[PDB]
Amino acid sequence: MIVTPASIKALMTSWRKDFQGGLEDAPSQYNKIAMVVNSSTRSNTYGWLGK
Amino acid sequence: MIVTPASIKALMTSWRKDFQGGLEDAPSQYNKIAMVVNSSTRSNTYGWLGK
After folding, report:
1. Closest C-alpha to A17, from B20, B47, B33, B24
2. Does B44 sit within 8 Å of A16, measured CB to CB?
3. Which residues have C-beta within 8 Å of that of residue A42, sequence separation ≥ 6?
4. DSSP string of B1-51?
5. In Å, how far are A4, A8, A36 from A1, measured between CA atoms?
6. Cβ atoms < 10 Å from Cβ of A13
7. Which candidate from A9, A14, A22 shows the least CB-CB separation from B51?
């Protein structure tokens, strides 16, 4: 039996990438309650007329 | 009545291979809760990056 040191025995591992994405984020569900509007300048102004 | 010895009349039986199966063992159901990876050294090292 060859008495190898501790560091050499610790280097004798194989790298596996099964844990790559970590834990996935929660589902996205903001489109159900919000209205999406695109702005083109410094700010948007909205205006409506009373009855 | 013919007096046959016990050694001759002990051969007067029928061999049946009906118990050959025996008692079956429990089902394998480790594939629903575990993931199978391979290895090629003393151990396996897994690493992932944070968010």
Report:
1. B47
2. yes
3. none
4. -----HHHHTT------SSTT-SPPPPP--TTT-------SSEEEE-----
5. 9, 15, 70
6. 14
7. A22
